[PDB]
Design a protein around this ligand. Structure first.
Ligand code: LMT
Ligand code: LMT
Ligand code: LMT
Ligand code: DDR
Ligand code: DDQ
Ligand code: D12
Ligand code: D12
Ligand code: D10
Ligand code: OCT
Ligand code: HEX
Ligand code: HEX
Ligand code: HEX
Lengths: 155, 1034, 48, 48
């Protein structure tokens, strides 16, 4: 789609006003680039909260996955976008989604030490014993990283 | 001095002869080039890191080198880019006047001492340090027409059999190969490697062992056993030389005894060193040579020598190989010289005709015909002495000086003719009296013109270098003109002119000349009558003068300013930019469409399209390309419709339809050594370790704000590349250690297969060339291919990459920029219509002051150049105005009479501005220098009117009005003679529409219009100036 | 070290000589490559 | 000396050269400084 590509670009660039116009004209909210990222992926990666909300109001797939199994919740949790994590979960994001590596949003939040996001994820039922392809849990990550605060939250 | 040489005509001839011989010698020795060196000296450091991403390059190469660029003299600034093709370029730009050799050796020496700090792979590739220059003399293309050779085949042939002989050709300063010589390519197969429990590590180890030079020693070497009868070198292992030998490299001997050879796990071929560029010439595989002219060389002789050498090579070319010349400046340069020599000859003919029309004897017509060539020849001698070249700028400088030179000849001879006709004196006595009337003014004129033009040589930077070419050329010609007017032409007048009877003004002649003389004598009385009436009512004309001044200023402010006019140089470019992540094959499809358009819809104008996939000035990569369009000769492209600007406009609109690609055509700048030099060049700087993402955010903030001022800023855009998706793979150290797999085997296996690895060198038909291992294409295309690569653990088991790695998509930069050692982002833009670049720069600085903490900025390139040149202009104008006034004050022994001359300035300028505006030209360098020569010649006209009038008042006691009327009466004929000759002489430049007509138009239009109004207005306004000024100051 | 004259001419002397172009005032260039691995390239420049 | 010749053979020739200057030209030659293994063609054993 022509407008699908302009929406991918506007969602990445945080151009709220342009996304508004594009939603009116019916730009494909399920458009995806060569790596499988939707506008929701891009808005979650770059932290554009308002655009994440507009996209979800316009029928975007909250649990879309890229060619390696990663969802917008993975990206928002990994890069510390707390408000986006909450919005995604309120709109049905899979809190225990596993990418091709077995890595969950909790793994990624723990790895970067995003304590608030870890608690939001756990509040929404994140599986604290989930293991990735190497057998590691969010707790293993906190011990290896030496994050004592995080290790106490993961009991 | 005139009286000295009037009595010594042989001495005067001797001086003329010496001048002509020096000039003849200079014409033979003088370098010839399209343009001289203009840009400040720049040195570029270039390095390659095969398989490296932009951040790896930046953080292991670029930062290290930058941190060592200390203790170098005369550095203005430093800039760099590190990109995802594994390349870094660092450019150090030095003050104008810096010795470029010293700058480069100082850079090279600091680099040498940083080499131990760089990665081994980069030390192996090496790091080149070169003087930067965008000026090519020509580009020789090499193509294969019978489809028997790839571009790699062609590049190797050029490297092995052409490049060196071209580099040795007379006048060639540098030769750059568009491609590489062959490399031995080992294309690995992961399935076969795993079948035999081998990895790229084993391949590399075997190649290094079995393709090597091994030192041995000597038989009977010293110290020997006495009685030894023979001494001979021992030759041991030497480098391999063929694909056959590489395939037989032994990798493993199996238990059953069977042998695993390199050809059992890899395809082996001679290929290119890299595959990022695909070059096509009208759809056919191509390579080529970019040739630069050597310092002091003759561009015309060098091009001829290059062609002669290529002819000698022709009998040895393989079948299908053809030479093409998609870019060659020397045809243009040859036309320029021809056109300029034409202008000077025609100018001398026109003076001959005007001299005969008015003076009606051939003996007088011969005196300028001698004097003007002598002056021009002497000017070449001075040019040589100053170390200048014959180039576009110096040549047009002499054209712009023609009026001044022609005028010195007309003025000297015409005045003697008048004196003879008005007093009946013999030629010798007449020349003595005539020179006594004008010699002081000629000297004052020389000083005044020097005050006008010399300060123009003291602008700094690139614009100053351009202005200096015109300044030295014009001042030199003007200075020789006055010397010749004081030495030679008086001697020629006294010895060559025939007497004229007192009162004889030719009115008694018959036929055309008798009628002409009566007509002109009557017209002179009509002229002096009009000036009488003008002088009876001066206040009205002072009002009209202020009107002219206001109209000048108004027309000046509205006249768009540029540097040098675009030219139909027979070539232009087409940018092809596809979305991020677009692959090479996709770019190739677009380039094919582009090539197909020019060869179909523009087949009567286009000779060739040189399509280069993978190269882009804004950044390299698979998603970018250029199409260099070479046109047929101007003689086959008649009319504006078939010129670059029209072709370009048509192409750009035609390509607007292309989907998922930005494709547009544009003309080249006049001076390719410089960029467009239009707009501004801004650097956003990370001053506090903010990092790439925060800098991008700050950039976007600035770009968005700039977009809110379309009235002031236009096309404010980043010059670099946007972040793109990249494949992040994490190796799990614990899992690697648990399985007994070393990290070095993992990273070598990954890098060698997917990025490629330069192993060592081999010798191909007597030439040393590189050996590269890399995965065959089909095993390194997609993430699923990662898991097909196995690494052998310590216990012998083969372990797939999937077992000890994980991956995810992320964004990163394909091109990281730095400025003076700090992260940066370059931003280009231009002032909106009607606004000055200075005003646009002011706003940019205001917007930049509101960016987040830690973000700074700087001006670079043209913008750095414009700020410094602008800071000098006020003081250079002041010095010119002050010195002009002082010279006139000394000439006239008066603090006030100078004003009557200096008031002439607007009279020429108004007509130059009118002609430029009407014709739709710009306030460019040729227009500006022409304004100075028009002002100069009008000031000369006024100087002689005022001189005559003042001398009549001082010596003959005549009244103010009486002397003014007698002065303008006497000066009418010579003023009209020069103006008629000079205006007709520049006419061909105005109407020219051929090659180089952009510069010819810019020289002629302003000069012709300025000469028209300067002539018409000055003969009426100068008497007003003198009368009004004398009345005010008694 | 250890390289013969032909090897050192192909891997050193010719590589250097190929880059000795476009030097100002160069009159001629002479070189030898010998069996000790030694290379000497001498560039002679115009008077002055 | 020819290809392959040794330092010892070169010394025999240098002895004959030195001998000539020290006997036949002893009225004209003050000194001879002769070097085996160094000459206009290199440092081979067959040069002096
Ligand atoms: C007007 C009075 C004064 C007389 C002198 C005015 C003109 C003097 C400057 C003219 C330029 C001299 O420059 C000279 O140009 C000629 C003609 O293009 C070139 O002559 C030749 O150059 C090459 C070599 O074959 C070819 O392009 C061609 O055969 C020809 O152009 C010389 O190589 C160059 O040195
Ligand atoms: C808007 C662009 C204008 C560009 C052109 C301007 C320059 C052209 C100058 C033309 C000069 C000739 O114009 C000249 O004008 C003056 C008035 O000033 C006339 O002079 C007339 O008026 C004056 C004053 O009232 C009387 O003293 C005089 O006896 C009478 O003849 C001249 O007879 C005429 O010859
Ligand atoms: C014989 C006739 C010909 C003779 C005329 C040739 C004279 C040569 C002129 C030399 C020019 C000197 O060059 C000029 O030097 C002055 C000295 O303050 C500098 O000075 C300038 O600096 C800055 C500019 O913002 C100001 O603070 C200062 O007021 C201004 O003068 C100029 O930037 C430089 O352009
Ligand atoms: C109305 C004013 C006209 C100015 C036109 C100047 C265009 C050339 C600009 C340029 O290149 O600058 C060079 C140089 C700077 O010193 O220019 C000048 O010096 C221009 C001033 C010279 C004229 C004053 C003398 C009066 C005549 C007898
Ligand atoms: C530096 C001053 C330049 C002005 C030149 C003045 C020359 C006037 C000479 C007058 N004269 C001696 C001939 O009577
Ligand atoms: C007859 C010689 C006239 C040359 C004028 C020289 C002007 C000096 C400029 C200095 C270069 C920056
Ligand atoms: C360019 C600077 C010139 C300043 C000198 C003015 C001359 C004074 C006029 C009155 C003198 C009688
Ligand atoms: C090359 C110029 C020759 C000049 C001839 C001299 C004419 C006679 C002067 C008295
Ligand atoms: C710098 C010019 C000075 C001239 C002034 C003279 C006025 C009497
Ligand atoms: C009056 C002396 C002039 C001589 C110049 C060469
Ligand atoms: C005519 C004198 C030239 C001035 C050069 C500085
Ligand atoms: C240019 C200033 C002088 C004018 C006299 C009225």
């Amino acid at each position: 789609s022509d407008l699908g590509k302009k929406l991918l670009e506007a969602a990445r660039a945080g151009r709220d006003d342009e996304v508004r116009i594009l939603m009116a004209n019916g730009a494909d909210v399920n458009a995806a680039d060569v790596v499988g990222w939707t506008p929701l992926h891009l808005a979650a990666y770059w932290g554009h909260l308002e655009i994440v909300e507009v996209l979800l109001k316009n029928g975007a797939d909250v649990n879309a996955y890229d060619t390696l199994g990663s969802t917008p919740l993975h990206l928002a949790a990994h890069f510390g976008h707390l408000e986006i994590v909450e919005v995604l979960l309120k709109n049905g994001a899979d809190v225990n989604a596993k990418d091709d590596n077995g890595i969950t949003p909790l793994h990624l939040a723990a790895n970067r030490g995003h304590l608030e996001i870890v608690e939001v994820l756990l509040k929404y039922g994140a599986d604290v014993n989930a293991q990735d392809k190497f057998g590691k849990t969010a707790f293993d990550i906190s011990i290896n990283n030496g994050n004592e605060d995080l290790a106490e939250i993961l009991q | 001095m005139p009286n000295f040489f009037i009595d010594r005509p042989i001495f005067a001839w001797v001086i003329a002869i010496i001048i002509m011989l020096a000039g003849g010698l200079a014409i033979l020795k003088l370098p010839v080039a399209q343009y001289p060196t203009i840009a400040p000296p720049a040195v570029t450091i270039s390095a390659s890191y095969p398989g490296a991403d932009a951040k790896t390059v930046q953080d292991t190469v670029t930062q290290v080198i930058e941190q060592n660029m200390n203790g170098i003299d005369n550095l203005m600034y430093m800039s760099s880019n590190s990109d995802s093709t594994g390349t870094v370029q660092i450019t150090l730009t030095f003050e104008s006047g810096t010795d470029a050799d010293i700058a480069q050796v100082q850079v090279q020496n600091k680099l040498q001492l940083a080499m131990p700090l760089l990665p081994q792979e980069v030390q192996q590739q090496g790091v080149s340090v070169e003087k930067s220059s965008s000026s090519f003399l020509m580009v020789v293309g090499v193509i294969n027409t019978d489809g028997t050779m790839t571009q790699e085949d062609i590049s190797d042939y050029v490297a092995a059999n052409m490049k060196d002989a071209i580099s040795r050709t007379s006048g060639v300063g540098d030769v750059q190969l568009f491609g590489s010589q062959y490399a031995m390519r080992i294309w690995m197969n992961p399935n076969e490697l795993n079948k035999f429990q081998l990895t790229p590590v084993d391949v590399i180890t075997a190649i290094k062992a079995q393709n090597a030079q091994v030192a041995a020693g000597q038989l009977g070497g010293t110290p020997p056993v006495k009685g030894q009868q023979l001494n001979a070198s021992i030759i041991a292992q030497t480098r391999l030389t063929s694909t056959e030998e590489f395939g037989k490299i032994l990798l493993k001997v199996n238990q059953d005894g069977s042998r695993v050879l390199l050809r059992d796990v890899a395809k082996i071929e001679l290929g290119g060193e890299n595959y990022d560029i695909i070059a096509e010439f009208n759809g056919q595989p191509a390579s080529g040579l970019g040739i630069k002219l050597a310092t002091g060389a003759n561009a015309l002789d060098t091009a001829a020598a290059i062609r002669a050498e290529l002819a000698k090579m022709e009998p040895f070319f393989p079948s299908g190989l053809k030479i093409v010349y998609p870019y060659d400046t020397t045809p243009f340069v040859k036309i320029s010289i021809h056109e300029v020599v034409k202008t000077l000859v025609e100018a001398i003919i026109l003076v001959f005709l005007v001299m005969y029309l008015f003076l009606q004897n051939f003996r007088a017509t011969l005196i300028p015909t001698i004097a003007v060539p002598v002056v021009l020849l002497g000017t070449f001698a001075v040019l040589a002495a100053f170390g200048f070249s014959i180039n576009t700028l110096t040549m047009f400088g002499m054209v712009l000086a023609i009026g001044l030179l022609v005028d010195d000849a007309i003025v000297v001879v015409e005045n003697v003719e008048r004196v003879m006709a008005e007093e009946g004196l013999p030629p010798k006595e007449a020349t003595r009296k005539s020179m006594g009337q004008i010699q002081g003014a000629l000297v004052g004129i020389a000083m005044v013109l020097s005050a006008v033009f010399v300060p123009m040589a003291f602008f700094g930077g690139s614009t100053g270098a351009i202005y200096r070419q015109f300044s030295i050329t014009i001042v030199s010609a003007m200075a020789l003109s006055v010397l010749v007017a004081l030495i030679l032409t008086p001697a020629l007048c006294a010895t060559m002119l025939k007497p004229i009877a007192k009162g004889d003004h030719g009115e008694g002649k018959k036929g055309f000349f008798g009628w002409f003389n009566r007509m002109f004598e009557k017209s002179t009385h009509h002229y002096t009558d009009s000036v009488g009436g003008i002088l009876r009512s001066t206040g009205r004309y002072l009002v009209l003068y202020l009107i002219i001044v206001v109209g000048m200023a108004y027309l000046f402010v509205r006249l768009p300013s540029s540097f040098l006019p675009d030219e139909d140089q027979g070539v232009f470019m087409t940018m092809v930019q596809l979305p991020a992540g677009a692959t090479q094959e996709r770019t190739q499809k677009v380039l094919n469409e582009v090539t197909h358009y020019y060869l179909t819809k523009e087949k009567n104008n286009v000779e060739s399209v040189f399509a280069v996939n993978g190269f882009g000035f804004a950044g390299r990569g698979q998603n970018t390309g250029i199409a260099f369009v070479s046109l047929k000769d101007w003689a086959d492209r008649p009319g504006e419709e078939n010129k670059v600007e029209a072709i370009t406009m048509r192409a750009t609109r035609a390509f607007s339809q292309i989907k998922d690609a930005m494709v547009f055509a544009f003309n080249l700048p006049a001076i390719v050594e410089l960029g467009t030099a239009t707009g501004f060049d801004f650097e956003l700087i990370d001053q506090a370790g903010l990092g790439h993402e925060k800098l991008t955010q700050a950039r976007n903030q600035l770009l968005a704000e700039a977009a809110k001022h379309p009235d002031m800023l236009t096309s404010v855009r980043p010059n670099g590349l946007e972040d793109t998706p990249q494949f992040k793979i994490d190796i799990d150290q614990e899992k690697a250690q648990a399985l007994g797999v070393s990290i070095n085997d993992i990273n070598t296996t990954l890098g060698a297969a997917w990025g490629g690895s330069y192993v060592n060198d081999f010798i191909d038909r007597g030439r040393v060339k590189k050996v590269y291992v890399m995965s065959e294409a089909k095993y390194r295309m997609l993430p699923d291919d990662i898991g097909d690569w196995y690494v052998r653990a310590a216990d012998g088991q083969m372990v797939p990459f999937s077992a000890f790695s994980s991956s995810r998509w992320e964004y990163g930069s394909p091109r990281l920029e730095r400025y003076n050692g700090l992260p940066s982002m370059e931003i280009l833009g231009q002032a909106a219509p009607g606004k000055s670049t200075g005003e646009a720069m002011e706003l940019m600085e205001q917007l930049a002051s509101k960016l987040p903490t830690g973000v700074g900025y700087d001006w670079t390139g043209m913008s750095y150049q414009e700020r410094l040149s602008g800071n000098q202009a006020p003081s250079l104008y002041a010095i010119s105005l002050i010195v002009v006034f002082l010279c006139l004050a000394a000439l006239y022994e008066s603090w006030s009479i100078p004003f009557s001359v200096m008031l002439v300035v607007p009279l020429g300028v108004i007509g130059a501005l009118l002609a430029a505006t009407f014709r739709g030209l710009t306030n460019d360098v040729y227009f500006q220098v022409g304004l100075l020569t028009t002002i100069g010649l009008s000031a000369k006209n006024a100087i002689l009117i005022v001189e005559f009038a003042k001398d009549l008042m001082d010596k003959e006691g005549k009244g103010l009005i009486e002397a003014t009327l007698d002065a303008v009466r006497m000066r009418l004929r010579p003023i009209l003679m020069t103006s008629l000759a000079f205006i007709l002489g520049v006419m061909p430049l105005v109407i020219s529409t051929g090659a180089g007509s952009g510069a010819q138009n810019a020289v002629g239009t302003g000069v012709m219009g300025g000469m028209v109004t300067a002539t018409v207005l000055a003969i009426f306004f100068v008497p007003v100036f003198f009368v009004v000024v004398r009345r005010r100051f008694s």
